[PDB]
Amino acid sequence: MREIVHIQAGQCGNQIGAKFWEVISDEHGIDPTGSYHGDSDLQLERINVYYNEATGNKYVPRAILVDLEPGTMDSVRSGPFGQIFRPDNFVFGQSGAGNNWAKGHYTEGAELVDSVLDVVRKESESCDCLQGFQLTHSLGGGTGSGMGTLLISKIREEYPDRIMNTFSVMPSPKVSDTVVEPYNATLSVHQLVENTDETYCIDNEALYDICFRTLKLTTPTYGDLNHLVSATMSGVTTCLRFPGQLNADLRKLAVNMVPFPRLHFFMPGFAPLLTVPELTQQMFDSKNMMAACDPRHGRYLTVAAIFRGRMSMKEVDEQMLNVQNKNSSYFVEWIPNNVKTAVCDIPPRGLKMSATFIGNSTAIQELFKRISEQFTAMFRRKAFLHWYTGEGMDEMEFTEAESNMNDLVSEYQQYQDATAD
């Protein structure tokens, strides 16, 4: 009775989306035909947050799949669980986005948008009580970025009192399928600052470096990255999917995580990439962050943390207290009790103990600076711009987005420098 509506858009969005569904379906005891063959009542208690009930007592993801070209989506059908989706929620076009943001947002994306909208409505109107939406996408492409943001906006007009939550994948020049990717990223961020309630900042840079420098994969695949992305996505939705003494939903989380509306960009973390103390230490280590930022180069405004496994409640309390105590400089003092903790009895598949971490840290500015540096290098020598005015855009709109993003950095800095007295 607290429904979320999921939307995957474009290449990245559909792949990480698919993985997400796989992982959580396994965790909930749901097969590719959509049947419950599982062992605990706990897997079903809050199953409708993500799944609809059906005919032949089936469970169907409340998911909508979206792309400007059928490529990635047929692989979705062909893939396992491809059969679990609802064939009407496949909304695709033909002409594609051609890795161009203006195409996602203004042109071809704009031609496809209403059919997505119609399916969104079909899904919302069946909800007993709609929490809101989560969109998986990338900010480097054209569909995911441009059309994902256009979607966000359009959905916001129709459900302005629902929570909008994004999993947004950030472009690194290591694993980097283009060159205009800073333009696309800046353009998307500009939108995101205004229209999402909460954005999980998933950085390919950080994903790459984890696989390379830590996991020892000298040549990391999209599959290796998305493995990381899926463990994370599982981690941060654990409190939505399972009954706790916390009751989480997207609004409560936003309320406890977002102290100023614009500052809603989160640094996720995961451990292991094993004892509670080690779990706790690694989980706060810059090496375990899914966004490529050192939390010791900033300060935490807020943090949510969840431990999965069977472990001592008392020990976790002690470790989390310890971590705040011994690192007190890295948490702002003007937000008392800004670190929250949940425990879930059920571990993810393949582990005995994990830990997932969500940070609202001003060190995230590092990430927006990276995109800002690259972006500006081009733009100021007006490199590759025709691609954009190509579709009717003005230069102004590039200036406005860069400003907005520099404004966001300025703001994160300002709250980082702020003191109690």
Add this chain to the structure above:
Amino acid sequence: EKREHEREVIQKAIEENNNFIKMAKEKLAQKMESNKENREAHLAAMLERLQEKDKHAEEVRKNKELKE
């Protein structure tokens, strides 16, 4: 004189229970009124911003058409 003082005391107690109830009732109505107003103005401003963004997306498609 004493009976009339008796009457005064008890009518004063009624009057005060009443003015308290009244005041409360008004205070509530004013706050709920101001509340609905404010909330509405926030939604309206949000929808206005969105709608400007729609209009702007016309002037970007209409403008690509004017390069031909």
Add this chain to the structure above:
Amino acid sequence: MRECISIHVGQAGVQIGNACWELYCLEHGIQPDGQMPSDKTIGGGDDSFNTFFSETGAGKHVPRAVFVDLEPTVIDEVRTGTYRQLFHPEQLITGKEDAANNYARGHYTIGKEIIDLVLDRIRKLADQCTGLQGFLVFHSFGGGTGSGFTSLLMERLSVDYGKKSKLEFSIYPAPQVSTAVVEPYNSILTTHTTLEHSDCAFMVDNEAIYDICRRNLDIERPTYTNLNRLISQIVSSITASLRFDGALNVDLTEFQTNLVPYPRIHFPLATYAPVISAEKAYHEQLSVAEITNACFEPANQMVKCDPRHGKYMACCLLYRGDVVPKDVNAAIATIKTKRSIQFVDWCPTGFKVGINYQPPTVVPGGDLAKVQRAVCMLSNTTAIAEAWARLDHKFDLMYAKRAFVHWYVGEGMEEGEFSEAREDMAALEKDYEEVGVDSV
């Protein structure tokens, strides 16, 4: 006659009510289906337990209660649970969507959609009463429903029942069991808003209850169920006067007279004893003198404050069980020699005593020894103001940066309500300072 109606609001209010009503059923010998073999009066009566329980023709004893929450997950467990036959479905009221830790949603946005129906159900309880005495309202400070909806409700109840008495059991937030960073906000707003509508409010500091569960019962990591089970023993102590009767029994309202010297100064400090495990109680009768003694130990208080550093305006002792006055008077005499309990110069120094003969019970499966005697002290001391100070301090740290405030403004609140609530609390802190200063 002399009925009391209990309203449990939000998660904490509800779960605490599960605990309290389970305990009451056990104290009175009422079975989970509501039958009570000992009541020969069928379909009604005027025994003391009828203050809290209505009777039906079928012999079911029905709480004079209403449970209310803005989402259904917690009350569903009552509808489904062991005691589900006790209530009529109409006493259990849920919406679909909660207040999301937001006082605005509780008082306005979501809450205004259900307030009429709640008042209507409460009115159906009041119509069954031949001499309604007042309301008992259970809620947390920190939740959106517990703060906002409770406030809205109290204002509405003042409107619909006048100066008919309203008492609070209010759950003050602790960082160990906390659920939202915005609890100080919700706490301040609800305290400011309800202050004129409440006659007496008992604060229960979750950190104190928590500390007590760790220390006296060796519970490594206490749950809501541990806390609630202790809280309910305290609430039972406080309501025993209404629910039972005997010669030495002294009505709560009579303590209330001594407890509230000015309308705003209506927050008594409770202290309970003994809290002890079965393990530790086996082969130890704790005498009147020991439990009386332990009432003056700050580690046994519902609220963390230091009464040694404030002044007393009142001191009440509420005994239950195997207790006779002679012992009490001896114990008090000893305390008075060995402690310097200091009062303000404008009030007398006596202790007010009451004794209920009916011994405490426990709920099976619990961690509390079943003892022969117990005591709750209710005192009014200026020290309780420490608990306002801490909360106010937290509010300030966030408010000075306007942190999270946008969530409240988004629901139609103004900053003015915040500054106005914080000014009221500042004035309350100053009142607590002034009552303790010696006279000219």
